[PDB]
Design an enzyme around this catalytic site. Structure first.
Site, mmCIF file in Angstrom:
data_model
loop_
_atom_site.group_PDB
_atom_site.id
_atom_site.type_symbol
_atom_site.label_atom_id
_atom_site.label_comp_id
_atom_site.label_asym_id
_atom_site.label_seq_id
_atom_site.Cartn_x
_atom_site.Cartn_y
_atom_site.Cartn_z
ATOM 1 N N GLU B 15 0.793 -1.252 0.000
ATOM 2 C CA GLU B 15 0.000 0.000 0.000
ATOM 3 C C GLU B 15 0.819 1.293 0.000
ATOM 4 O OE1 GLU B 15 -2.406 -1.391 3.238
ATOM 5 O OE2 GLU B 15 -4.158 -1.658 1.929
ATOM 6 N N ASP B 200 -11.969 -6.230 -3.249
ATOM 7 C CA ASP B 200 -12.730 -7.483 -3.151
ATOM 8 C C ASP B 200 -14.087 -7.163 -2.583
ATOM 9 O OD1 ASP B 200 -10.689 -7.479 -0.588
ATOM 10 O OD2 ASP B 200 -12.679 -8.289 -0.041
HETATM 11 C C1 LIG Z 1 -1.355 -10.856 2.967
HETATM 12 C C2 LIG Z 1 -2.231 -11.756 3.791
HETATM 13 C C3 LIG Z 1 -3.115 -10.967 4.742
HETATM 14 C C4 LIG Z 1 -3.982 -9.919 4.046
HETATM 15 S S1 LIG Z 1 -5.158 -9.293 5.216
HETATM 16 C C5 LIG Z 1 -5.950 -8.021 4.305
HETATM 17 C C6 LIG Z 1 -5.195 -6.696 4.377
HETATM 18 C C7 LIG Z 1 -5.852 -5.720 3.417
HETATM 19 N N1 LIG Z 1 -6.590 -4.754 4.277
HETATM 20 C C8 LIG Z 1 -7.866 -4.333 3.744
HETATM 21 C C9 LIG Z 1 -8.872 -5.355 3.252
HETATM 22 C C10 LIG Z 1 -9.225 -5.660 1.917
HETATM 23 N N2 LIG Z 1 -10.231 -6.601 1.892
HETATM 24 C C11 LIG Z 1 -10.580 -6.952 3.147
HETATM 25 C C12 LIG Z 1 -11.545 -7.871 3.753
HETATM 26 N N3 LIG Z 1 -12.340 -8.622 2.925
HETATM 27 N N4 LIG Z 1 -11.587 -7.960 5.105
HETATM 28 C C13 LIG Z 1 -10.787 -7.201 5.909
HETATM 29 N N5 LIG Z 1 -9.875 -6.322 5.414
HETATM 30 C C14 LIG Z 1 -9.764 -6.188 4.075
HETATM 31 C C15 LIG Z 1 -6.651 -5.291 5.644
HETATM 32 C C16 LIG Z 1 -5.313 -6.003 5.728
HETATM 33 O O1 LIG Z 1 -4.279 -5.025 5.885
#
Ligand SMILES: CCCCSC[C@H]1CN(Cc2c[nH]c3c(N)ncnc23)C[C@@H]1O
Ligand SMILES: CCCCSC[C@H]1CN(Cc2c[nH]c3c(N)ncnc23)C[C@@H]1O
Ligand SMILES: [Cl-]
Ligand SMILES: [Cl-]
EC number: 3.2.2.30
Lengths: 232, 232
Positions: B15, B200
């Site tokens: 980001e 998403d």
């Molecule tokens: C690399 C493995 C872990 C990734 S965890 C997701 C990231 C992206 N951020 C935002 C984010 C997008 N979609 C989401 C969702 N469906 N639920 C909750 N947070 C989000 C929160 C966190 O910093």
């Protein structure tokens, strides 16, 4: 003049009221970031006492303030917790050997529960402080357990969640602040001890038990914390 | 000499990579509390850029450091989020009018979900910054929504949780850091803007979509953030 600086934290006001009273010295009240820091001098140590307010965000903020703004050299947390194991009964004390954030869930990406990239499931506390607590407890003929403490942003009061905490993390107790406090301390290289006294059994009766035993359990933890500070 | 200081935060390295590149100036890397703060000068403003790492504890810590250690005067968060409403599609931008910690549960004591004693369910952001974003978006002919953003320590990827977030909080998007960033800013009286681009739809396909669109959505948010900084 160049006294050791010790930060002392509870989550709720009720967890620090007995601490302030037991030290029995005058404190200056210093507000910062929505917390009130009570700064005093006790046995040639500067003690900085505050309640964070409940949960992980509150406790992270207060710990960070204590370290960056007050320059504390050790952090001792004192308060109450839910028991997850039958050998920890109401009023019993434990120190956290490790902490975990039990509500963290990135399993959508096949990470183990509790795990966040660039971090770790379990956060360590100070071996030296934990050993001091053990020494004092044995000298006072008080029982003191050591184990894993689970922290999250929910009050746990169901058999299902309790069993999850035991199966997933092998936790002995549950609360809402210890992991965040220990996490921050770790990042800044500050020794940390998380001390808790049992208030409830983290089941469907937990709200009742907590209401009944908050005051007494908080006092038990406070008394023990003071006994630690006396030897620092 | 006495330049305005602006803190800029993402959660993941991905980001902030496009942010650093888009500003296109040299940065000094300053480590503190396990974060790396990139300090540079852009259009006569000191800009301090960092990724917090994922979740509420990480983001609380980094925000607190930015304010207490770097003295930033405003905080702008840029990154990606899951959409909870059909009118927010992949790549679309929104600013949070309010944030909530969606995973906080003290219902055992009849507190509403999201609520913690001595705090509030909803945390406000800067009207002035939000109005600036709206002005710029209209001048650039870009769509920009305003709404409630829900933050918690779980990646949301189920229809059930998505529906809960809508019914309980009327949230438009979900992420894991905004509420903690806004909370800290509020406590220190620092103007805050939380900007997100959809990656998403926070359902069973969210892991897939996130993997596909993280880079692009992060870049979209980064570009918009820079356009805001240009007018500060
Ligand atoms: C690399 C493995 C872990 C990734 S965890 C997701 C990231 C992206 N951020 C935002 C984010 C997008 N979609 C989401 C969702 N469906 N639920 C909750 N947070 C989000 C929160 C966190 O910093
Ligand atoms: C006044 C209304 C809200 C009370 S929320 C409970 C307090 C006491 N702290 C420890 C605590 C004891 N028992 C627990 C349990 N069963 N689950 C999780 N935490 C605990 C965490 C939090 O600071
Ligand atoms: Cl005194
Ligand atoms: Cl440059």
């Amino acid at each position: 003049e160049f006294m050791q600086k010790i930060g002392i934290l509870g989550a709720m006001r009720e967890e620090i009221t007995p601490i302030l009273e037991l030290f029995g010295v005058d404190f200056e009240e210093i507000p910062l970031g929505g917390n009130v820091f009570h700064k005093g001098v006790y046995h040639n140590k500067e003690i900085i006492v505050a309640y964070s307010k409940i949960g992980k965000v509150h406790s992270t903020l207060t710990t960070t303030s204590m370290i960056l703004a007050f320059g504390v050299q050790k952090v001792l947390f004192s308060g109450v917790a839910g028991s997850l194991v039958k050998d920890l009964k109401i009023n019993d004390l434990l120190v956290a050997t490790q902490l975990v954030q039990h509500d963290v869930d990135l399993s959508a990406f096949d990470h183990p529960l509790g795990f966040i990239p660039e971090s770790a499931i379990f956060i360590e506390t100070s071996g030296s402080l934990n050993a001091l607590a053990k020494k004092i407890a044995n000298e006072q003929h008080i029982a003191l357990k050591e184990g894993v403490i689970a922290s999250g942003d929910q009050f746990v009061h169901s058999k299902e969640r309790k069993e999850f905490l035991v199966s997933e993390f092998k936790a002995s107790a549950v609360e809402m602040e210890g992991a965040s406090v220990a996490f921050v301390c770790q990042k800044f290289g500050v020794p940390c001890c998380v001390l808790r006294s049992i208030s409830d059994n983290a089941d469907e009766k937990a709200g009742m038990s907590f209401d009944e035993f908050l005051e007494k359990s908080a006092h038990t933890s406070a008394k023990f914390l003071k006994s630690m500070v006396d030897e620092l």
